[PDB]
Amino acid sequence: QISVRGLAGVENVTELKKNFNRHLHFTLVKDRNVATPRDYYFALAHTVRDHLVGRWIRTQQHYYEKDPKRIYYLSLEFYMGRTLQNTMVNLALENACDEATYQLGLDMEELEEIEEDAGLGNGGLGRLAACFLDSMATLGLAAYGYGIRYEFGIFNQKICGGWQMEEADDWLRYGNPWEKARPEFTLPVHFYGRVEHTSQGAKWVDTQVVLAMPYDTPVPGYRNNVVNTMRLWSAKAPNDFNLNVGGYIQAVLDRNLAENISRVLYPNDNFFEGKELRLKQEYFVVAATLQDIIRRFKSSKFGTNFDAFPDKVAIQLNDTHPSLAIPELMRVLVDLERLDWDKAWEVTVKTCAYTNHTVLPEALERWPVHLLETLLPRHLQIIYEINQRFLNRVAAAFPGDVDRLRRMSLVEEGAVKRINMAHLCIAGSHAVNGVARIHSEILKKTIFKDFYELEPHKFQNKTNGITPRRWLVLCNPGLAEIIAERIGEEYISDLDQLRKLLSYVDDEAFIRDVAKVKQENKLKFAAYLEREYKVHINPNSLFDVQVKRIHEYKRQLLNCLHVITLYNRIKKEPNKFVVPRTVMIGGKAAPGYHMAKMIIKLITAIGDVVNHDPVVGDRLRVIFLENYRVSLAEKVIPAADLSEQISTAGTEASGTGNMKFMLNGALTIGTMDGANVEMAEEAGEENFFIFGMRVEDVDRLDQRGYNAQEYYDRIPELRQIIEQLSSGFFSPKQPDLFKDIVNMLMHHDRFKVFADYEEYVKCQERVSALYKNPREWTRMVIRNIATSGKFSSDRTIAQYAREIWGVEPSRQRLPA
């Protein structure tokens, strides 16, 4: 139907149809008369997967022969979403499969909805890993993603009585056609035990063993015949585990304890919990991965001599979660390979690089020493030794500066002794990067200032990106097509080409097409809400959307205050015209985060009042988007008009949702925080709705002391809202329901919601004004899309490759 989705050749469609029928018969063991729609999805998935395997085998064969420097991206999260459409797009098979399924009397889109999200991540950090894998394959890098195969990913969110309920995400229930189990590469991981000293070095003995079994998932590049690997470890009990009838039975059932390591993703978005099971997950991925790395290095054309290790291996630590890679690599080199400390350390530093993903103090990993002492006794010893040698370097560089020593130490003294994992990562890496220019500067100026002064060369910026494959071509084919009509298809792997669209900003045909694509997206999403959730919205209204995990710093509460302001203004002057809005807010709250759960309840409670007020009519609707996840993002983002990016300046390291909205034709209201700053710089500040305190203003307010009451006293509209919340206007049966929210806003608000309220409301008025002028709204949209090229993860990854890993990207095809 549409050109960007590839050709539907006669030979291809015929071949797909017969391979589809073959899988249905031989693989699913069904015939057309008994086949469930799920069977049809699985038949298609197998048919598409077949087209991957030859390229997958030859790519990995190619790396063996050419022996390039290998990149290992270590993460505890890979937020992959669905795989079927992505694979079709990257292989140029989408139209052919659409045609083949049509002729079989099947709707492919319906089949696509049957696939479970691989929800092996919480939010931005996990999704970044997924975009990065796509870009690394597209850029022809010999890259491997290494993580954990959680049996249960991020919980499914149900809203019941306005409250979040969690249900297990049993994503493997029906099986995963995309993975290949590789039991031949099963590896032992050690826990507990004790350290013995002998004549020839330390030995780690009396350990418990858990097995690590890899599962490989293919990662196809965009139309370059490259297929890389994401390898995820699953925990398995050794067969002699724990080995009376009750005793026998119990010994078998106790195998569950070892396998619990890979059972479930920790649902903490921006917060730290020193739980033993989490530490075990962290070491499990690190120990198994490093053995795989070393095996592959020895089986190379060089391996014996580890001098060349950093020339053949790069290890990227996705935050501090896999930080145990540093002392684990030292352990292996020193204890097992018998290298001297100094050489081992040189190899380690040159091998490892660390990316920081937040400055929020509560999110930083600080493990109690007694935990590491029990679980990983050898690693604690190595960490102590790293610390002593590091602090000797500090002492020599800043003689007499005793407080610098305590500030820089990897060991934090106190009630309980802790290891600061961030300090470990800086010491043991040759590069440290933030994820947006302002974030990277904040690192050098505040939290890692001491380390920057000691080793300035180590610190870098790598502004985040998103993949234009999933986040344009896949989720917004209509916009991809109208763009390709003007400028061709090469922008898909070279997003800077979107700049050519600037010479169409006054093109009346293009303006009409951009606005038409948006309207179609909005109509489709408006229908989705009715069909799947029985809610009725006005598709002519401005689609005002804030989708992201629920946290105080992201200030969903500031959005709530605006919503209530609009409602109160309508109730004050009912017969006055206002630009109609559909306000959509969505995101999951971490199970133990009480405030975040209260915020969700507030949003739904506002909806209950606003959506049923006959005086409001269809002029204002407030909807909480349930179970926000990658697949829902692919639907809502193309439908959005207004992107809410309203974190307190200095708190959102980068953001990536922001970039997704920019690429898909929404305008942005936001603070000068994270990547918003660079987005506004690229598009031009006049083409952005910027408001609020800058980082410097926040700092000034902190020095003076933030007094929320001042704002309450001086803003009558704000006062009205707080009184409504307090008095039970939004909870008539439970008048005090929101007392905690009011108390926090008035007395302990770390994120200064009130301080930005006035500028926010005023900026929102400017948004409404522009929306009243469809032509000028769309021209500003075009100027955003046209300048979104910097925010492709292809650019981000090319910068990592050149400036950190020391490898050159390649756009050349491998043979088909």
Ligand X SMILES: O=C(N[C@@H]1O[C@H](CO)[C@@H](O)[C@H](O)[C@H]1O)c1ccccc1
Contact residues toward ligand X (CB under 6 A) are 123-125, 128, 269-270, 319, 357-358, 363, 435, 464, 652-656, 674
Is 400 among the annotated ligand-binding positions?
no
Residue 54 annotated as part of some ligand binding site: no
Angle at 285 between CA 167 and CA 264, to 5 degrees: 10
Question: Which residue number, 145 or 214, has a Cβ lying nearer to ligand X?
Answer: 145
What does DSSP assign to residue 681?
Answer: H
Closest CA to 321 of 357, 346, 291: 357
With 0-12 / 13-18 / 19 or more C-beta atoms within 10 angstroms meaning exposed / middle / buried, residue 237 is: middle
Q: Quick one: tokens of 499?
A: 């700049």
Give CA–CA dist 35/432, Å, rounded: 53
Output the smallest distance, CB 722 to ligand X, in A: 29
DSSP string, 505-570: TT-HHHHHHHHHHHHHHHHHHHHHHHHHH-----TTSEEEEEES---GGGTHHHHHHHHHHHHHHH
Which one, 123 or 140, has the nearer CB to ligand X?
Answer: 123
* 296 annotated as a binding-site residue: yes
Nearest to 466 by CA among 781, 789, 685, 785: 789
- Paired with 146 in beta bridges are 74, 231
> Dihedral (C-alpha) 33, 34, 35, 37: value to the nearest 10 degrees?
100
CB of 680 to ligand X, least distance (A): 16
814 secondary structure, DSSP code: P
Annotated ligand binding at 297? The verdict is yes
Q: Which is nearer to ligand X, 95 or 656 (CB)?
A: 656
Closer residue to ligand X in complex, CB, 4/436: 436
The residue assigned the tokens 């009725």 is 536
**Token pair for 650:** 């200095």
Radius of gyration of the chain (CA): 27
SS3 181: strand
31 has binding-site annotation: yes
Residue 207 among the catalytic residues: no
Catalytic member of 548, 555, 621, 790: 548
Q: Which is it for the CA torsion 336, 341, 344, 349, positive or negative?
A: positive
Residue of minimal CB distance from ligand X?
Answer: 124
Dihedral of CA atoms 803, 804, 806, 807 in degrees, nearest 10, equals -90
Q: How many of the other CB atoms lie within 10 Å of CB of 341?
A: 14
- What's the N-to-C CA distance of the chain in angstroms? 25
Give the residue carrying structure tokens 């084919």.
477
Q: Given the residues 138, 289, 351, 656, select the one marked as catalytic.
A: 656
CB of 292 to ligand X, least distance (A): 25
Distance of closest approach, residue 558 Cβ to ligand X, in angstroms: 17
A 10 A CB-CB count for 596 gives 22
554 is catalytic: yes
**Among 660, 752, 779, 783, the one annotated catalytic:** 660
| Structure token pair of residue 36 | 């469930």
Cβ proximity to ligand X, 81 vs 674, nearer residue: 674
Using the minimum distance from each CB to ligand X, give the nearer residue, 76 or 782. Answer: 76
Tell me whether residue 236 is annotated as binding. no
State in angstroms the smallest separation of the CB of 326 from ligand X. Answer: 17
Give the active site residue among 82, 236, 378, 549. 549
Instruction: Write down the catalytic residue from 49, 51, 357, 418.
Output: 357
Residues in the chain, total: 816
d(CA 809, CA 801): 7
What is the C-alpha to C-alpha distance for residues 471 and 198, in angstroms, rounded to an integer?
Answer: 56
C-beta closer to ligand X: residue 269 or 552: 269
**Token reading at 183:** 């039991």
- Please tell me whether 300 is known to bind a ligand: yes
Q: Kindly state the smallest distance separating residue 439's Cβ from ligand X, in Å.
A: 8
Catalytic residue among 82, 554, 555, 601: 554
Whether 295 has a binding-site annotation, put simply, is yes
Quote the tokens at residue 430.
């040759």
Is 549 designated active site?
yes
Query: Does the annotation flag 597 for ligand binding?
Result: no
689 is in an annotated binding site: no
Supply the minimum distance, in Å, between the C-beta of residue 647 and ligand X: 8
Q: Which is nearer to ligand X, 262 or 356 (CB)?
A: 356
Shortest reach from residue 75's CB to ligand X, in Å: 11
Which CB atom, from 157 or from 656, has the smaller least distance to ligand X? Answer: 656
Clarify whether 312 is annotated catalytic.
no
Closest separation in Å from C-beta 652 to ligand X = 5
Whole-Å CA distances, 583 to 586, 644, 691, 777, 806: 10, 10, 19, 18, 46
Q: Which two tokens stand for residue 476?
A: 């917004």
Q: Is 729 annotated as a binding residue?
A: no
Per-residue DSSP letter, 447: I
Tell me which DSSP letter residue 737 carries: T
Active site residues: 357, 548-549, 554, 656, 660
Which amino acids are annotated as binding site for AMP, given as ranges?
31, 64, 295-303
Which amino acids are annotated as binding site, given as ranges?
31, 64, 295-303
